[model samples]
Target: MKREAIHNFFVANQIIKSTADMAIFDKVPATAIYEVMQVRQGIPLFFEAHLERFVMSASLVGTRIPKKEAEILHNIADLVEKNKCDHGNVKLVSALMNEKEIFLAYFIPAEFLDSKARLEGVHTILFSGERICPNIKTIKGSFREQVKAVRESSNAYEALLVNESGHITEGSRSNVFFMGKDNKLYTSPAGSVLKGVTRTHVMQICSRLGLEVLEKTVHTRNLADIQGAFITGTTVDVTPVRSIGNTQLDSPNIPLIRKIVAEYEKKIAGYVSKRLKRARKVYVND
Candidate 1:
């Protein structure tokens, strides 16, 4: 099935709950499609952050996301207003289907990181190889089957994409970062992996907090030398690594990690508060 068809089905059947809303993709003009992650009952994580990334991704694909982004942004705010929720996972899909551009956003419940993340870290397996193009975020087109097997066979939490050259690039669905002996951070260059927004945020925030960030390819053999490691993205933000493929590092007290997380939380709160205040001011002027 075409990826667009699958997306329409998901929206019409499960997301929208209206069979009448479903349409055949081939009959419709297709544009860019993306999965917007959200949490149930809780506000979307960095709503503007995701919006910026979504727009950027579509632009890279040469599909100009319609200028009605403000409306789409309101759609998100309205949904949150209509439903009083605290925390959960959410995903919104945007694309052109059947000559009409459509936007679908939904939120569901999923496990979230608690204050004690080091105590509850996830498992990950290195990827068997690399893909031809590293820049495109294709719809699981290249290694979907392998992803399923790795997630299952590893009896672990997630999988990483490691090349035969022994460089650990990224996880199947997440980005990888390692803290070297100097406590400096290193991740795969943008061309080698998905340049995730949260990954970028961490780079900036960590630097502000006095950590050096490096965009360099990490060697697989150095996995053992990594004193402190974590992964970050839209959903997974700064998840501490308890072990790597059964090899656990001498975990730091994680005080520095806590400081990093707290700083991010503070920044997010200030951003949201300022946005709310500015929004109210606009309403008064209108």
Candidate 2:
């Protein structure tokens, strides 16, 4: 898959350089492992969590991240600073070339939804398929290509993947949650979906609020049993699902979802500022 590096500069290993010369991935036929993070206030939100997830991805797929954690973090900060991109998505790609690893960090095109869009919610479609390693983030071009076709044809915000067992597992690009009829939240079991950074924070908030979030997958045949639905990811944050294919829902209006959305926003702000307050050698650029 080819990724277009945005802005005037990007990070290739140690140096913060021009976006031009980004043809290494395109020309090498390399197997790529990557993670996309949202940057706000000139800071990478939950950066350590995302990097840890990247390492987890490497381990699960038998790949390697030869760069040190501090090295990668500083590279990202340098890229952000050079690009002057205060808010956007940055993609960290680790590609295997001739049995060796190369790292690239660059800005990608992204859209940030406003509160109005969150309250209005978004539409989703159901696609029948499953990923090989749903927990890991990698370049699954064909799967995403197929999902994109269905998504474009249906004009949906996301395509929720349904396994052969008639289970609604997770979104193509996000983790999912449903507001059950019993007022409890529903999520897919571990090892089935991407263990998203935002998803972890959402779970933490749920625990603090004394809310019950069952780690049970929702079935396709019982879609009507749920009151509402939403998705979690680094890019989307927490977005309510207004409709799941033919199933109508008021996800943003659901008391539980609304609270989660608000709390998750607070979590985002807290994480960014908390990291900023720590040290210059840590979250911020030295």
Candidate 3:
């Protein structure tokens, strides 16, 4: 009996429907490298950055994706065109299955926060755990499932992963940040976290806004003293954290956070329009 994905997805330049036999995916190694991308208005946002991370992830794990950058870009565009989904999250995977290297890109279910939630912020809980290779993004089902289940159990939007040293390493699917008493931003160092695409952009925003990003360890002990908190990722963007367990954070009200958020939005708008303008010329040429 051949197994298949539970829904339609892209694999090896082909769309695999629920009825299709995608048995090879079952052979995917647990160490399979992967990256999630956010697509908006038919464009894969910050694609070059995402691709660089994808390559870095494979290199860190001592694996190689035979596919070239231009080829992968074409495949992603094909998937976006075929699916006709203008906005959503994309899960790209590079794996060796049955002694054959394969690449897969597909749309995962995207759960978006409403504007109200985005403005007011979200609640999260602390979970004491860490990824095996913090810098390498790979397929680890058990731990991710546990975190997802825990989030649902606590009715929390995200689960902040705490390392053995009691430091807030990152979030399950996002990067965590806190504004300190000195109005400086703090987060787990890049090597210690997933080095998210949005995290990179947020760091850039910090520089232009004249806000310092410490990239230092933030701990549960310091949560109470933090002036603001937020999480960044492919889909979530710059979402403020309203509470971590019982620790309430007035993140949205913090002036520095507001500046960061506004600047990030502007950056996103510029990225989308810039890509779309070039896309229009391509369409006319074709």
Candidate 4:
């Protein structure tokens, strides 16, 4: 006999009845603010940070989240248990109608870097595009859809966004960091890029490793000056970038990249352990 599959998505505080629920699908297409979080061992990593960012995003767009942080956390935990998902990506979205807001949360199946990709590193291409407001994470227009074409054509792991000033701002979906020839780590300043949860954690790892950090623009033309580059995001951890545009950057410093990856993994383990304890209390109280 086959195992029964349970629904893994909820919309407007209700489990979606089925795919035929066009009303719910209609709300998704509307403008909204959303967050995607990585879950491990039934724990949403950096959940508090993600929640804080979501509130900030809502304020930027003048939107309101009907649910409080604790309520939202409970809903996510409920969804994880119902779906029996121990590891995957969880997405939470809040869409607005004339004067009301509709919130949606769901478990999305996730994939990680394959062994070959990890060993060989990844490739990316420079593209001419910039986020409307780099700080706010809103469901903007068709920019991402447009960039998808270039990314697919280049067979690149990600597309690096080059702003109008010809400075490499960030990736279409992730934050980028370049290790300069001087051995200093550089990335776009706070106001110019989205402060991703994973990116913040990577910065913490850098501090622990004693890597000198600098907030500076990495112009595309000066790619040769960079020793190597890597991107950070919820799904893509510290993935080293092997090439940019048509030029192949030098091989990543294997030892350094390994250290950062290992440290980040340690951070995750420590965080999950603490959160697991708190999660049990939440469940018991309910």
Candidate 5:
């Protein structure tokens, strides 16, 4: 089979019959928790952090993962190696079904922002929706589909979800940050949104850049005070938002934002180096 056509998805300890069969299997009653992580040059970027979030999400629903952490890591490495996947995203899913837990590890095609979108930013629409549990990463098929339709209708790259009180919590699949007119950074507080791995790193970048950071609910009515906004995720990275709904945001301070992006790229490089070094040591010892 062609590498792209390979049915390398797992359901518990057994491999699914084929990609076409996934639809049937997906209908099974299961509490699904998943993580989508970037892979570059055969390395699973932020592997440890992603796994940590995965475990936390599972624990929230009282789901017991069938495999140990080491086994999960080995499986990810093996999957990347077997598929010769040097780039794109790998998704790790844990589902509790029929009082038993099943795990899935697979590679889905990754879509990233093009140079124009990254440099000029993308248009976004605000959706009035909120998650039942704001923190845990659970499967919300219906809500996701709804957001997909909204994005299509608005011709938007993403949909930012606003809570009942009209505060912008985060994006449908990413965390959001705004550049306030005060020239400080603002984002939803910790308990109000998913604590994304990239979001954490971006906060670190802000600290290092000496940008005053504010963790509070960003209200939509206050867009006039907001200069610009951006999103961070496994795929989008630091993509600026050119417009929200009908409000045109100010052009981002490219030099400052680019500095942050540059530092983030450096951090990824450093992480890959450390990961490869550790992997080499393990291989030698074994």
Candidate 6:
């Protein structure tokens, strides 16, 4: 079958199925993908967070999603039902090529939580570089493949990409943040990194607390001077980093980090309370 034709079929099928389907099948032809996933509390860690990012990604990829938002939401709801994903990881990828297509799936896993965060924090190495092009989340196989190689060779928890002059960028799959010596929180501006959902929420929380949240280029050479660091995304809400690029931060759990994390945790709990109430009624009606 022609690749574009297959792509069209998958789009149609996704809406019709109202639930995502997965095949342990091999790729057939020219199709590229951009994906997002997160798991938490026996429930996918960030459902709305993932959805928001998916929408942003669609726009950035120039996918014809604006016209199909309703269909996509319905398809995702159907997928939620079809997959019966109560607690697990969910991945939604937009095909970012000439044609706009989406391939999405979610599954309940035997294990998804990371013990590293719950126990001791994770370690990281910084590599200075950004995904080329200030905009457009395109497919760059070589970069991803190479990052994976670097990740494997280093026992680091995650790879923090830095720029040529040695500035902290982002992680291979997560966003990075550090509590500065001045007590302000820092992360690369939006243009320098993927516009992440959890990252957005973190900023919102910081704003609420009147915390100094600045967005600027972070130099890697000065990471040793940082008070502490943490990474955020869907899979892991906020995993504190004890060490950065082999340089350890003295305090992993700072009062500021705790305050922000606690506030957000409460916000999520309240939101989940409402969601569960709604889910119960829907289940009963069904």
lDDT of each: 0.61, 0.80, 0.78, 0.74, 0.74, 0.59
> What is the C-alpha lDDT profile of model 1 across 1-286, one tens digit per residue?
1332221123321233322344533333323355445442344557777677677777777665554566665555544554444354555555653456655554534545544444756665676778544554444323445677667787555567778888888776567787777777788888888767677778788888877778897887887677767767656666676667877754434566556656766766676667667778999999
What would the per-residue lDDT of candidate 3 be over residues 1-286, giving only the tens digit for each residue?
A: 1142233546564444332556666766677788787788877888888888888777766777767888877777766766766678777778864468767777777777867677778888999888887777777622457677788888788888988889998888889899887777888898888878889899988888787789887777987678789999876788898899888888889987877878888987898899999989999999
Write down the worst ten-residue block by lDDT for model 2.
22-31
User: lDDT score, residue 30, model 6?
Assistant: 26
**What TM-score would candidate 5 get against the native?**
0.87
Candidate 6 Cα lDDT to native = 0.59
Candidate 5: 10-residue stretch with minimal lDDT: 1-10
- For all predicted structures, in order, the TM-scores are 0.75, 0.89, 0.90, 0.87, 0.87, 0.76
Question: For model 1, where is the 10-residue window of minimal lDDT?
Answer: 5-14
The count of residue-pair clashes in candidate 1 stands at: 14
**Which parts of model 6 have CA positions greater than 4 angstroms off?**
1-12, 15-35, 39-52, 66-70, 73-84, 96-102, 107-116, 134-138, 141-144, 282-286
Better of 2 and 4 by lDDT: 2
The reply for model 1, stretches above 4 Å from the true place, is 1-32, 39-42, 78-86, 97-102, 114-120, 129-133, 141-145, 152-155, 251-254, 275-286
lDDT of 2 by residue, 1-286 (tens): 6657889998877877787767765643335778888888778878788888888777777767768888877887788788876889998888765556578888888855656556679888998988875666766622567786678788687898898888887788788898888888889887777777888898899999998689996789878788988999877888999899998898877888888999998988888878667865564564
Query: Which has the higher lDDT value, candidate number 2 or candidate number 3?
Result: 2
User: In model 2, which runs have C-alpha deviations exceeding 4 angstroms?
Assistant: 27-31, 97-99, 114-116, 141-143, 278-286
Which candidate ranks first by TM-score, i.e. highest?
Answer: 3
Better of 5 and 6 by lDDT: 5
Q: What's model 5's lDDT at 21?
A: 44
lDDT of 4 at 268: 84
Descending-TM-score candidate ranking: 3, 2, 5, 4, 6, 1
Poorest 10 consecutive residues of model 6 by lDDT? 1-10
